[PDB]
Every structure is written in C-alpha cells, then in structure tokens.
Design an enzyme around this catalytic site. Structure first.
Site, PDB file in Angstrom:
ATOM      1  N   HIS A  66      38.817   3.818   1.352  1.00 24.87           N
ATOM      2  CA  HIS A  66      38.808   5.238   1.013  1.00 24.87           C
ATOM      3  C   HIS A  66      39.921   5.530   0.015  1.00 24.87           C
ATOM      4  CE1 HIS A  66      37.664   9.369   1.345  1.00 24.87           C
ATOM      5  NE2 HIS A  66      38.831   9.755   1.826  1.00 24.87           N
ATOM      6  N   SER A 117      39.234  12.247  -2.750  1.00 22.87           N
ATOM      7  CA  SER A 117      38.679  12.714  -1.473  1.00 22.87           C
ATOM      8  C   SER A 117      38.331  14.190  -1.615  1.00 22.87           C
ATOM      9  CB  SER A 117      39.648  12.361  -0.343  1.00 22.87           C
ATOM     10  OG  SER A 117      39.184  12.855   0.903  1.00 22.87           O
ATOM     11  N   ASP A 132      32.274   4.149   2.242  1.00 20.88           N
ATOM     12  CA  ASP A 132      33.480   4.962   2.325  1.00 20.88           C
ATOM     13  C   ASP A 132      33.848   5.244   3.778  1.00 20.88           C
ATOM     14  OD1 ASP A 132      35.351   6.942   0.629  1.00 20.88           O
ATOM     15  OD2 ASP A 132      34.642   8.011   2.413  1.00 20.88           O
TER      16      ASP A 132
HETATM   17  C1  LIG Z   1      36.719  15.722   3.105  1.00 20.39           C
HETATM   18  O1  LIG Z   1      35.651  16.298   2.400  1.00 20.39           O
HETATM   19  C2  LIG Z   1      34.537  16.602   3.192  1.00 20.39           C
HETATM   20  O2  LIG Z   1      34.651  16.648   4.372  1.00 20.39           O
HETATM   21  C3  LIG Z   1      33.189  16.878   2.518  1.00 20.39           C
HETATM   22  C4  LIG Z   1      33.187  17.336   1.210  1.00 20.39           C
HETATM   23  C5  LIG Z   1      31.990  17.599   0.564  1.00 20.39           C
HETATM   24  C6  LIG Z   1      30.791  17.405   1.229  1.00 20.39           C
HETATM   25  C7  LIG Z   1      30.792  16.948   2.537  1.00 20.39           C
HETATM   26  C8  LIG Z   1      31.989  16.679   3.190  1.00 20.39           C
HETATM   27  O3  LIG Z   1      32.004  16.219   4.517  1.00 20.39           O
HETATM   28  C9  LIG Z   1      30.762  15.764   4.982  1.00 20.39           C
HETATM   29  C10 LIG Z   1      29.963  16.600   5.750  1.00 20.39           C
HETATM   30  C11 LIG Z   1      28.739  16.153   6.221  1.00 20.39           C
HETATM   31  C12 LIG Z   1      28.315  14.865   5.937  1.00 20.39           C
HETATM   32  N1  LIG Z   1      27.033  14.396   6.433  1.00 20.39           N
HETATM   33  C13 LIG Z   1      29.115  14.025   5.178  1.00 20.39           C
HETATM   34  C14 LIG Z   1      30.340  14.471   4.706  1.00 20.39           C
END
Ligand SMILES: COC(=O)c1ccccc1Oc1ccc(N)cc1
Ligand SMILES: *[C@@H]1O[C@H](CO)[C@@H](O)[C@H](O)[C@H]1NC(C)=O
EC number: 3.1.1.98
Length: 344
Positions: free
Chosen positions: A289, A145, A243
């Site tokens: 996940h 994660s 996911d």
């Molecule tokens: C837990 O890790 C994260 O929250 C994260 C890590 C890397 C890149 C994005 C991330 O969250 C997101 C943000 C925005 C969108 N659209 C999807 C996912």
C-alpha cells in the site's frame, strides 16, 4: 527540509477550526511545481470523528504541527533518491479535513467540525501564486491513498481555478497513488460510509461526473474507474494489484484455501481490467500500500521499467508511443509477489 506556512486566510480551517497550511521548499531554478496530498482514512459521523480527535489529532488540527518536514521519495531533492523531479518546487499539504479532500463546509453553530478539504487545495494554490507558482509551466497534483482519491476529485477544479484567475499557460496534471478502489463484494461480511460521509461533509465531486450519476449518487465519483473517464486533465494512475487497504475493507487478512485463492486472483484480474483503457499507469502485482513518498520507491519495476522512469516517459509524451520509454505498465501474472521486485 520543507517549511510550514499556515494559510493567511484563517477561515480555511482543519477539522477543529485551526488554520490549515502547507510545507514548501522552493527551487527558483525550476518552473515545475509538485503539490502532494497526504492521506489517512476519514471519519463520517460525530461519534467516530470524536474518536479520531482523541488518537489521530494531527489529522484534524494544526495546533501540534512540527515546524518543518523532510521531503522523501518523489518529494526528495536528491537525484539519487528522486530521479524524476529532484529539482522541482516541493509542496506537502497535510491532511486535516478527514473528508477524502472533498469537503466544503465550515465549522458553525450546526456543525461541530469543519470539512474544507476541497477549499484547502484551492487556497493553497491561490497563496502560492504570489510566491512563485505564477511562473510555472507544469503543476503536478499528486497524493497517496485518500490523497490519491483526492487527486481524482480535485485535479480538474485546480485547472478551472487557474484558468479563471488568468493563468492559462500552466499545465495541470495529476498523479494518483493507491487511491483506485473497487466497490466489489467482500470476502466476508463499506460504500455506505462514503455515502453518509458526503452528506456529513457537504462533499463535492467533479461536475461532469456529477451530471452522469445525478443527485444522491455522488458516491460513485469516489471510485477511480468511474470518475477517471470524466476528467480532462492528464492523470497517471499508480495502484498495487493487491492493495492492502482494498483487502482490509474486503475483510481479507493474510494456508490459503481454494475460496480465498479464487477471491484474491479475481481481485487482481478485475483491477487489471479497469486499467486497460488508462494509457498512463503503473500497476505491479504486489501486496502492499502506497509508493511515491517512501525513500526506496525507485526499486519496484514492471516489465523492467521503474516508476520514476515511467513518469519521465509520461513527461516526454506530453511535449505516438516512444521507443523504449513506456507509460502503460500493468503486470499480468496472477498472484502476490509474482513480480520479483515487490517490496519486502
Ligand atoms: C481510504 O479511502 C477510502 O476508504 C475509499 C476512497 C474512495 C473509494 C472507496 C474507498 O473505500 C472503499 C469503500 C468500499 C469499497 N468496496 C472499497 C473501498
Ligand atoms: C477566505 O476563504 C473563504 C473560503 O474560500 C472565502 O469565502 C473568503 O472570502 C476568503 N477571505 C478573504 C479575505 O479572501
């Protein structure tokens, strides 16, 4: 059991200034070392970091760490549970910086919290070299994660660090589990939190990626399909096609009507597309996940091949394709759990 070691350099700290550390189980009989990065979301301003300190304090402090931990999944030393590297040296690095392992800023008189995730990895590596790692042949940096994204952000810096310290024979590789996200449209009305976090953490990204996107667009390098082509160390990517953390940020919570059906099917297709030029990958069509540190990680298969087998084939390939020992395994069916081996 893995045993806790607090960092001897007490200036490399968790969020609240307590020392960071690592859990270690040695195997003198092996020259392979597995360093695993824990996950657990993040915080991006004073107010929501204060909230995280109230009810998720182990992710911000070492004060309450238990004195040992049990290795599970890929961190297990039992061949029955871990067919891949059961005899390796095992390291579990707790996630106490709340910065997706990107930060390089100390607690100070301007900063209520320290965000030192990138420096914690550097210091764990340096202290391990006097403790056996100097004789290693392979260092596998893994994580799940937020720790999976941390692998993508730090694997090439660990390679550069070992080269500069005088250890060019150690082969650095990465295994990113459930940290391959898409910056897509939500189903109902997220990247802004990453942008704000980077400035709050003084976060750092790989240099080749930074030069592409340039000042103030560093948030792009947190997304796997953008940062992966800039990396030079071999990286194996594990990602559920549907996911649950991705669907949560997309505001999807599971009678599915046509609008939601098309959204879910398009997400799986887009994820599959981003992995077509990724030669070492494992992407089952499941709603789940994380994978690699749960005890039953051996059960899932893509096209009849388990993840521990695919990782062993990856090892063999780095000694072109191998007969009956594949490394690129991405499902093509379009709906959650169309693969019968998905976890229940
Ligand atoms: C837990 O890790 C994260 O929250 C994260 C890590 C890397 C890149 C994005 C991330 O969250 C997101 C943000 C925005 C969108 N659209 C999807 C996912
Ligand atoms: C401890 O780590 C910090 C950050 O990497 C570094 O600046 C400092 O020199 C280190 N301390 C010692 C004694 O090496």
């Amino acid at each position: 059991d893995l045993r806790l070691h607090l960092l001897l350099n007490t200036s490399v700290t968790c969020n609240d200034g307590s020392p960071a550390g690592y859990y270690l189980k040695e195997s003198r009989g092996s020259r392979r070392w597995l360093l695993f990065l824990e996950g657990g979301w993040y915080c991006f301003n004073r107010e929501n970091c204060d909230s995280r300190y109230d009810t998720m304090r182990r992710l911000m402090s070492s004060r309450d760490w238990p004195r040992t931990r049990t290795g599970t999944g890929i961190l297990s030393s039992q061949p029955e549970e871990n067919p891949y590297w059961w005899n390796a040296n095992m390291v579990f690095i707790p996630y106490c910086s709340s910065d997706v392992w990107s930060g390089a800023s100390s607690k100070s008189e301007k900063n209520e919290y320290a965000f030192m995730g990138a420096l914690i990895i550097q210091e764990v590596v340096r202290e391990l070299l006097g403790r056996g790692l100097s004789g290693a042949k392979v260092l596998l940096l893994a994580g799940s994660s937020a720790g999976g994204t941390g692998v993508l952000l730090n694997v090439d810096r660990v390679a550069e660090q070992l080269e500069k310290l005088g250890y060019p024979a150690i082969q650095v590789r990465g295994l990113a589990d459930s940290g391959w996200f898409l910056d897509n449209k939500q189903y109902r009305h997220p990247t802004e939190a990453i942008r704000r976090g980077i400035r709050y953490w003084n976060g750092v990204v790989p240099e080749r990626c930074r030069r592409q996107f340039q000042e103030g667009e560093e948030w792009n390098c947190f997304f796997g399909y953008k940062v992966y082509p800039t990396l030079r160390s071999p990286v194996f990517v594990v990602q559920w096609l549907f996911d649950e953390a991705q669907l949560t940020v997309d505001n999807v919570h599971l009678p599915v009507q046509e609008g939601l059906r098309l959204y879910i099917q398009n997400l799986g297709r887009e994820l599959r597309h981003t992995l077509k030029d990724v030669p070492a990958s494992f992407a089952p069509a499941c709603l789940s996940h994380e994978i690699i540190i749960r005890s039953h990680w051996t059960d899932v298969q893509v096209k009849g091949t388990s993840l521990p087998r695919a990782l062993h084939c990856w090892d063999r390939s780095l000694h072109t394709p191998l007969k009956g020992c594949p490394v690129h395994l991405v499902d093509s069916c379009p709906w959650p759990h169309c693969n019968p081996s998905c976890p229940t």
